[PDB]
C-alpha cells in the first residue's frame, strides 16, 4: 500500500515568520492531496485541496505546492491563532491513509 | 432598487395564488407564477395582481448573491409602490374606522 | 483540388478487419465474427469523426489452406469447398460444426470452391432506426444501443477429412458504400483501451517544447 | 426584452442557432439553481432531458408519457462588475458518452447526472479502484478528446471584458424519431472556464452563473 | 448552513457491536457521500469506510469483517455497525461529508462522540 | 347509442331538460358505485358538486380552482328482468336545505353528504338527543314538505313495467354567478321508491341502480 510520512516532527516558531512543512508519498498520486488543521480538541477543517487550491474561508497566508511525490505547504506569516496540528491526506485510491501529524507550539 | 450603480444580482418575485400555500423554498416558488427580476439591466420591475375583499402572498427570493466591486458598500435597500391598475368597483359607502 | 476530400472518397476503402484460423477435424473448428467497426484501431478513428452514419456494406473473403502433418501413405485430396453463413440480428446461432443452424432457411450463405474468384457478398443497411450510431449516451448496461446490431458471420468446411487434416485461414475485408455522415465530432486524442466502450486514460494535450519563445 | 412564456418572465437585450435549422403548461422558463464561479474552478455539466424531469411539470409529462420529441433553447448569463476578468466557454454537445475512471466498467447513474444539480469537473485525475466514477480530468473533457477542439459543436464565448451572456437554440438531434426518455440523454450542456476568474482585493470573490432552459414544441 | 450531527451510545461492553447514526441537514444524499474517520491518540488518524452517492460502499482493509454501512435517502440518516469492539477502539469517531466541489475530501465534520471499550 | 366523451363510453337507446333552457379532460362520464334496491328500501340521495369532488380530476380542478360554473347531465338506469315490479321517482331538487333531528341545532357535514357514497333514507323517525343527525323520515322527504308534491321539480318516473331508465339535464341555478364550491351544494339528486319492489321465489332478490353523472361546460 501507499504510505504518507509527514516531516518534520514539530515546530516552535514565533509569530510572523515564514515556515515550511512537507510530506512524502510512496507512489504517484497526481496532486490528489488534502491538508487539514485541528486545534486543541476540535474537529479538523480543510485548508488546501488538490495541493494548490485554498478553501473558501481560509486566508491567503497558507500556500501549498508539489507534484508527483514531494508535496509541501508554506505559511508566510504566523498569527496567534494558527497553532495546532497539521495533517496531509491523499485521496488517490482506497485505502485512504493520512500523514503522521505535526504540531506548532508558537513559543 | 435604490442601491449602488455597479452592483448586480437577480431576484424572484413570486405571487402565490389564493388557495395555494406560502412557498417555503426557492424552488417551488419558481414553479408557481413569478417573474425573475435583474438589477444590472433595469432598476424597476412591475408585478400586477388581483385583489378582492389564506388569500395570497407576494414573497420575494434571492436568486443569486449580490456581486459588487471593491470600494463600494454592499448593503442596498429596496422600495415598494402600489397603485390601481384598472378602475376599481366600489359600492355601499360607510364611514372609516381610522378615528376615535 | 477538393474532390479528394469528399466524404465518399474518405471512407470508400478496404481493410483486413479479421483474421482467424479453423481446422476441419477438431470438432469445434469453425470461425466466428461479430460485425462491428470497432475492431481495427485505424478505421475506428476515421469513423468516430462523425456521430450518425448510414452506409451499405460489401464484404470479400480471401481463403487459403495448408496441409497439416498427416501420417503416411500418399495423401491425395480433392478440392475443398467453404461455407460462409451470415446471420441477421435476431436469428439462430450455431455452436458446433454440425448443428441445425447451418441447414436453416432464412440465413443466407454462400458456397465457394477453391481456385476461383474470391466470394464477394453485399449486405444492405439493416436497422430499425434511420442511422447507425457510433456514440450513444444511454442505457440499453451503459452505452450499448442494441438497435445498431449488424449480425455475425460463420465459416466451416463442407468436407470430411480422409487421411490428413487441413487448416485454413480467412481475411475478411470491409468496404462501406454510399456513405452519408451527420454532426461531426472532434478527433479522439487519447489512446484506445477496450473494444466495447469509450474508456480511456488521461493524457497530455501536445508534445512539449522547451519554453514559450 | 422581457419575453414571457406561460407564467414566467425573463428580461434580455445575440443568438447562435443549432446547425442552421430551426426547431400545454410546459412552455415556461425553467431555472436551475445558480452555481458559483470561483478562482479555482474547473467546469460544470448538466444532462439535458434529465435535469428537467426530476422537478418540472414537464417531468410530470415524462412519467405519464415516456416517449417524446422536444426542442430546447438555453439562456446562460453571469452578472459581474467591470472589475472582474475571465473567460467562459458555453457549448452544448450531443451524445456525450463519458468514460469511466475504472478501465473495465462503465459509470453508474448517479455519477453521470445529478437531478437538476450541476456535476463538477476537476483538474486532476481520479481514482480507479474505488467505484463507478466518471473520469473527469478537464483537459480531456471526459470524452477522451482534446479540449481545444471542442468548438466544432454549437458554442458561444462568454468573455467578461465585453460580452455578458449567451443564448443557444438546439434542434432535436436523434436517430430514431421517437425514443424513450428515461434511458437516453441526447444533449449535454458544458461550461468550461479557460481564463480563470481574477480580481483584486475588495471586490466580491465569486461570480454567479444562472442557467435558464425553456423547451419549445414538446410533442406527445 | 446547518451541518451534520451524530448521536451515539458513548459507552459499550467489550467484544460487542456499536451503532452510531449520523444525522444530516440541508443537503441531499444523492449528491454527496459521507466519510467515517476514527481519530485515536495512539494510532493517529485512520480512515474506516465510505458510502458513495450511488449507494456503493468501500471499507478499510483491516476492518473488512467488522463493518457494515447503510443509509436512507428520504429519511436522511446513515447507519454503520462496528463489530467485535476490541480494546484498541478507545477512540473518538467522526462523521464527515465528502465531495467538496467534487474532489473527494472531507469538508465539514460531526461533533465527535468518544467511545471507550472498558467497564 | 354508444355516446363517448374523453375516454369513456356509455350505450343508450327519452330526455327531460331543466326548466326549458339548455346549459379539458373533465368531460367524461363519471360513474358512482351502484346501490342495491331491496324490498324494504326507502330512498337514497347524493349532493351533486360534492360527490364529484372527492374522487375525480374534476375534483382536482376543484382544489386548485374553487369558484366555478358547471352544468350537469344525469343518467340513471336500473336493469331488471320482466318478472320484477315496482316504481321509482328520480328527481333533482335545487337548494335542498335539510333539517336536523335535534330541534335546536343544524346537522354536521358528514351526515348531509357522503363523498360519492349514497346516504340512505328511512321510514321511521330518528333520535333527537344523540348528535347532529339529519331528520330522515321519508314521507316528509327531509325538508318538511309533503312527499307527494315533489314532482314540481324536474323529475322523471322510472316504472319497471314499461320504462327502464331516466336521463336528466340540469342548467346552472344559482343567485351569484360565481360562488365557492367548497361551502355550497346547489343541486341534490333524490331517488325515492313509491311502489316497493316485489318478486316471486326463484328470481334474484335485488335490482342494482347505477348513476352516471357527466358535467358539461365547466368554466374556470
mmCIF file of N, CA and C in Angstrom, chain D residues 12-17 73-76 155-158 163-169:
data_model
loop_
_atom_site.group_PDB
_atom_site.id
_atom_site.type_symbol
_atom_site.label_atom_id
_atom_site.label_comp_id
_atom_site.label_asym_id
_atom_site.label_seq_id
_atom_site.Cartn_x
_atom_site.Cartn_y
_atom_site.Cartn_z
ATOM 1 N N UNK D 12 -34.170 40.169 -21.333
ATOM 2 C CA UNK D 12 -32.895 40.165 -22.049
ATOM 3 C C UNK D 12 -32.698 41.468 -22.814
ATOM 4 N N UNK D 13 -31.666 41.533 -23.653
ATOM 5 C CA UNK D 13 -31.449 42.701 -24.505
ATOM 6 C C UNK D 13 -32.130 42.554 -25.858
ATOM 7 N N UNK D 14 -27.528 38.616 -28.729
ATOM 8 C CA UNK D 14 -27.101 37.799 -29.857
ATOM 9 C C UNK D 14 -27.456 36.335 -29.655
ATOM 10 N N UNK D 15 -27.734 35.635 -30.752
ATOM 11 C CA UNK D 15 -28.159 34.244 -30.705
ATOM 12 C C UNK D 15 -27.346 33.452 -31.719
ATOM 13 N N UNK D 16 -27.091 32.190 -31.394
ATOM 14 C CA UNK D 16 -26.443 31.258 -32.305
ATOM 15 C C UNK D 16 -27.262 29.976 -32.332
ATOM 16 N N UNK D 17 -27.767 29.627 -33.508
ATOM 17 C CA UNK D 17 -28.800 28.612 -33.644
ATOM 18 C C UNK D 17 -28.201 27.355 -34.260
ATOM 19 N N UNK D 73 -34.156 25.635 -25.924
ATOM 20 C CA UNK D 73 -33.384 26.863 -26.042
ATOM 21 C C UNK D 73 -32.845 27.198 -24.662
ATOM 22 N N UNK D 74 -31.605 27.671 -24.611
ATOM 23 C CA UNK D 74 -30.863 27.798 -23.365
ATOM 24 C C UNK D 74 -30.339 29.216 -23.248
ATOM 25 N N UNK D 75 -30.641 29.873 -22.137
ATOM 26 C CA UNK D 75 -30.023 31.141 -21.789
ATOM 27 C C UNK D 75 -29.018 30.901 -20.680
ATOM 28 N N UNK D 76 -27.827 31.467 -20.824
ATOM 29 C CA UNK D 76 -26.811 31.439 -19.783
ATOM 30 C C UNK D 76 -26.303 32.856 -19.615
ATOM 31 N N UNK D 155 -21.455 26.499 -30.074
ATOM 32 C CA UNK D 155 -20.839 27.092 -28.905
ATOM 33 C C UNK D 155 -20.949 28.601 -28.978
ATOM 34 N N UNK D 156 -20.591 29.243 -27.873
ATOM 35 C CA UNK D 156 -20.681 30.690 -27.747
ATOM 36 C C UNK D 156 -19.755 31.125 -26.627
ATOM 37 N N UNK D 157 -18.870 32.065 -26.918
ATOM 38 C CA UNK D 157 -17.899 32.502 -25.930
ATOM 39 C C UNK D 157 -18.504 33.547 -25.015
ATOM 40 N N UNK D 158 -18.375 33.341 -23.716
ATOM 41 C CA UNK D 158 -18.673 34.371 -22.736
ATOM 42 C C UNK D 158 -17.339 34.907 -22.261
ATOM 43 N N UNK D 163 -18.578 40.855 -23.597
ATOM 44 C CA UNK D 163 -19.842 40.143 -23.605
ATOM 45 C C UNK D 163 -20.315 39.874 -22.182
ATOM 46 N N UNK D 164 -21.572 39.464 -22.054
ATOM 47 C CA UNK D 164 -22.077 39.165 -20.723
ATOM 48 C C UNK D 164 -22.887 37.882 -20.647
ATOM 49 N N UNK D 165 -23.496 37.472 -21.754
ATOM 50 C CA UNK D 165 -24.454 36.380 -21.736
ATOM 51 C C UNK D 165 -24.268 35.508 -22.962
ATOM 52 N N UNK D 166 -25.095 34.471 -23.052
ATOM 53 C CA UNK D 166 -25.031 33.528 -24.156
ATOM 54 C C UNK D 166 -26.367 32.827 -24.288
ATOM 55 N N UNK D 167 -26.909 32.815 -25.503
ATOM 56 C CA UNK D 167 -28.174 32.154 -25.789
ATOM 57 C C UNK D 167 -27.971 31.130 -26.891
ATOM 58 N N UNK D 168 -28.436 29.909 -26.663
ATOM 59 C CA UNK D 168 -28.334 28.837 -27.637
ATOM 60 C C UNK D 168 -29.718 28.337 -28.010
ATOM 61 N N UNK D 169 -29.827 27.784 -29.213
ATOM 62 C CA UNK D 169 -31.042 27.134 -29.683
ATOM 63 C C UNK D 169 -30.629 25.808 -30.295
#
